[PDB]
Structure formats: C-alpha cells, structure tokens
C-alpha cells in the first residue's frame, strides 16, 4: 500500500514560468505624449 501511495503521489504532481499579459490603462487626468511650444525661435519639448 505504501509503495503505491508514494509512487502515485510523486508521479502525479510531476505530470502538472509566467505567461505574458498585455494590459491597457486609460488615463483620465493627464496626457500621453510630449507637449511642444516656442519662444520666438526655439522649440521646447516636455516629456
């Protein structure tokens, strides 16, 4: 009985890493992407 329970317990759990996943997160109070403005000749970019 013990030779069956030990074998069927260590041979059953071995019969059975992290999967990738894509999440989408909507922003409600800010902007994605850079903002651009000018001071008469030069361009400023804010990340």
């Amino acid at each position: 009985y013990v030779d069956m329970v030990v074998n069927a317990a260590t041979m059953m759990d071995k019969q059975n890493l992290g999967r990738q996943k894509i999440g989408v997160m909507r922003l409600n109070n800010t902007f994605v992407g850079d903002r651009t403005y000018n001071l008469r000749d030069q361009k400023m970019v804010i990340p």
Binding site: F31, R35, Y37, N38
Partner: protein, 51 residues
C-alpha cells in the same frame, strides 16, 4: 488654432491650446518704405492647458 480635446472622468473637456492671432500693422503711406517688402506684422501667441 491647434487643439487636442479629451474628456475627463466627470464629463469636463480638457484642451491643449495653441492660439495665434496676427494682423498687418501699417506705417505711414507717404514715405518710400510702403512700396518695398516691409509688412510690419504684429502677432499674439498663447500656449496653455485649460479644462
């Protein structure tokens, strides 16, 4: 105008504005500088974010 509208969570509209309003200022017409390439331009630029 260059605008980028977006709805917030409460129903308000946030905008990213780039406003320019210009026209042509004219000097005295009797002098010679009215026939050459001198259109004195006056502009008005505003860049901000409002909601």
């Amino acid at each position: 105008i260059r605008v980028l509208p977006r709805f917030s969570a409460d129903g308000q509209i946030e905008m990213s504005l780039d406003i320019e309003d210009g026209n042509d200022k004219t000097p005295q017409s009797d002098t010679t500088t009215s026939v050459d390439a001198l259109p004195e331009v006056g502009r008005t630029l505003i860049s901000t974010i409002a909601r």
